[PDB]
Design a protein around this ligand. Structure first.
Ligand code: FES
Ligand SMILES: [K+]
Ligand SMILES: [Mg+2]
Ligand SMILES: [Mg+2]
Ligand SMILES: [Mg+2]
Ligand SMILES: [Mg+2]
Ligand SMILES: [Mg+2]
Ligand SMILES: [Mg+2]
Lengths: 97, 49, 86, 100, 137, 135
RNA sequence: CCCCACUAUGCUUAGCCCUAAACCUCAACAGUUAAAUCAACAAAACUGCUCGCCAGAACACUACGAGCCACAGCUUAAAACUCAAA
């Protein structure tokens, strides 16, 4: 018919979907350094996904990993272990003064 | 009292191109003032109230 | 009770400014939800009431976030009138 | 041998550009309101850019400028709406002036 | 060095000192700020009691105990008995959201003590005892 | 005598019918023109309805074979530092110049994709084109 | 209603009891988005198919009968008199 007519296909300019900082990585309850990055320094409260930026799947793995690590003797509950206070701050929460 | 004249002829065609606004005299003035402001751009108290 | 002390919920005072240290601590406990948690725990909230309030709080946040997004989007045109007189 | 519309569209610069996000385009200032510059860049809608602080007086009607496009049309659908709300303007960042 | 609101961690080598004493050696002022009373006890780092004052022990009774000025008076009284025992710097540990939560700390300062840190230890059960039923008012 | 039922038929049908019934003594000035040169669709009020379930609009996305080449070029080399001039109807961007060379080499019998893309970049470099890889 | 004290009770075990505004107040399954979009409100409007259910209000989550570990219980569930509304 006509060579210049549009052709059916999938979007070639489509961009990849977004990924959380932990997409594709195993979350172990023994990796307390990673888990501590998602709890409050002062109170030990687990951050919601709106602060951590994690997706539903990793938000759940982190939560379950934290709860497992806490009661098995790997992680404190009421505060962030001070050893991990100087790790990369990946959470959208501003506290001090 | 001053009476506004008929605004259309025998054929029924209004004289002014803004007749159907209902405010042809007011909107004709706004059109003349707005047009002057345009031409300026292309080119570029005590005793009065 | 079994944890180490003077780590959790602990703020150091700078230059004797105890008021600013207390405000920082109060801000910390507020942001983590501890103040509201303590207050709601003075009297027992019944499960039917807790679910109703949590549902109301979650829906109000969505509506407020969505109403903020609309106002931000529709404030781009707050600039001066470009066609004044027309 | 009359060119068809399908032919015009395939070989149009706007079609050849692809996505508009982060595309450098040349615009032309056609209307100015105080420090608001109205710039057409070949699309459906103009963009509105604030006069840069540096060399602000160099931006006048007819001045051709360089833009980094973000969206050809700013539209969003809000909760409880059957259609999209549009502000009838493009989103672009003014970089500077184009000179030869 | 820049100021850190995080307290020095015991076992690490910090440079902060108060009258030649480390953070772990500074006495502790325990303030219990209840809704109807305020109790203040100053203890040593070894858990030796040094001074005690409360609104009830300062001659306040009934609803007057549940006021800021009553807690402020209790703080001054505890500071006086503690200062006699050699206390200058104290770590403040306040549990409870009563009216004497902040005022009790003011009295400690007016009494001659320097507060180097503030710690909240208000008991928060993680799931615990069922509280009393809501009030109809 | 007339009809303001704008949702009942069209201005033509309502006018034609009232003219037949003798309600309108004279035909309007436009009636004879509409009759001779009617629109493609008779203007009848319709209520726009919302689609539900498995109903989808028939509009199709406009894509071209070269769009695959454009996506890769933007990924590999990014958007050219040269600025698009959408006012000139014959403007050619660095990507379009790449696409034209890529198409020419494909017509010479080459069929591999990864090989047909590397040879195209070399040709442009020989012609003096600046191709700074993004990464 | 407010304050304090305290018991049955809330818990565990083994048996019962079988009721909720047991409510998305939307029966299950399948299909449609074109027709008229549609009393109103809720939760956009409908088709096919099947089971359950309903036929003015009140009497009545009642009486009697029957069944039930239930015995001040539950399920099923009328009538007479009365009204022109509900
Ligand atoms: S986005 Fe992939 S696991 Fe989180
Ligand atoms: K319900
Ligand atoms: Mg239920
Ligand atoms: Mg069924
Ligand atoms: Mg009946
Ligand atoms: Mg019953
Ligand atoms: Mg019965
Ligand atoms: Mg019976």
């Amino acid at each position: 018919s006509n060579e210049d007519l549009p052709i059916s296909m999938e979007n070639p300019y489509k961009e990849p979907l977004k990924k959380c900082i932990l997409c594709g990585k195993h979350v172990d309850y023994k990796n307390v350094q990673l888990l501590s990055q998602f709890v409050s320094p002062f109170t030990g409260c687990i951050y919601g996904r709106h602060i951590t930026g994690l997706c539903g799947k990793k938000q759940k793995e982190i939560t379950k990993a934290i709860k497992r690590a806490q009661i098995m003797g790997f992680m404190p509950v009421t505060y962030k272990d001070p050893a991990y206070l100087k790790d990369p701050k990946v959470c959208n929460i501003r506290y001090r003064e | 009292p001053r009476q506004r004249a008929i605004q259309w002829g025998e054929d029924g065609r209004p004289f002014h191109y803004l007749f159907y606004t209902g405010k042809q005299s007011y909107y004709s003035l706004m059109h003349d003032v707005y047009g002057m402001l345009l031409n300026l751009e292309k080119h570029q108290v005590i005793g009065s109230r | 009770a079994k944890h180490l002390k003077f780590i959790a919920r602990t703020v150091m005072v700078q230059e004797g400014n105890v008021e600013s240290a207390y405000r920082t601590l109060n801000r910390i406990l507020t942001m983590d939800g501890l103040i509201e948690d303590i207050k709601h725990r003075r009297y027992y909230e019944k499960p039917c009431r807790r679910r109703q309030r949590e549902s109301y709080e979650r829906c109000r946040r969505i509506y407020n976030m969505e109403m903020a997004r609309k106002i931000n989007f529709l404030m781009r045109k707050n600039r001066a009138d470009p066609w004044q007189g027309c | 041998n009359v060119e068809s519309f399908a032919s015009m569209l395939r070989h149009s610069p706007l079609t050849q550009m692809g996505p508009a996000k982060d595309k450098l385009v040349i615009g032309r200032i056609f209307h100015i309101v105080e420090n608001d510059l109205y710039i057409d860049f070949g699309g459906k809608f103009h963009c509105v850019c604030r006069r840069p602080e540096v060399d602000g007086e160099k931006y006048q009607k007819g001045t051709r400028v360089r833009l980094r496009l973000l969206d050809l049309e700013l539209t969003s659908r809000f909760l409880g709406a059957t259609t999209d709300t549009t502000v009838l303007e493009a989103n672009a960042v003014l970089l500077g002036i184009q000179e030869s | 060095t820049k100021f850190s609101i995080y307290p020095p961690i015991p076992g690490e080598e910090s440079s902060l000192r108060w009258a030649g004493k480390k953070f772990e050696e500074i006495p502790i002022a325990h303030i219990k700020a209840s809704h109807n009373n305020t109790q203040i006890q100053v203890v040593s780092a070894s858990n030796e009691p040094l001074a005690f004052a409360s609104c009830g022990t300062e001659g306040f009774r009934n609803a007057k105990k549940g006021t800021g000025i009553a807690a402020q008076t209790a703080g001054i009284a505890a500071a006086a008995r503690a200062k006699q025992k050699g206390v200058i710097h104290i770590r403040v540990v306040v549990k409870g959201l009563g009216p004497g939560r902040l005022s009790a700390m003011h009295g400690l300062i007016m009494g001659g003590l320097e507060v180097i840190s503030i710690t909240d230890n208000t008991p928060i059960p993680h799931x615990g005892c069922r509280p009393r039923k809501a009030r109809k008012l | 005598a007339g009809s303001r039922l704008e949702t009942v038929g069209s201005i033509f049908s309502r006018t034609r019918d009232l003219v037949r019934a003798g309600v309108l003594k004279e035909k309007p000035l436009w009636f004879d023109v509409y009759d001779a040169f009617p629109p493609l669709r008779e203007p009848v009020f319709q209520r726009p309805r919302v689609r539900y379930g498995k109903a989808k609009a028939p509009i199709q996305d406009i894509w071209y074979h070269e769009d695959r080449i454009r996506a890769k070029f933007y990924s590999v080399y990014g958007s050219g530092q040269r600025a698009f001039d959408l006012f000139n109807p014959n403007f050619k961007s660095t990507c379009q110049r790449f696409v034209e060379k890529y198409t020419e080499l494909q017509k010479l019998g080459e069929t591999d994709e990864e090989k047909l893309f590397v040879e195209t970049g070399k040709a442009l470099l020989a012609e003096g084109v600046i191709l700074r890889r993004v990464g």
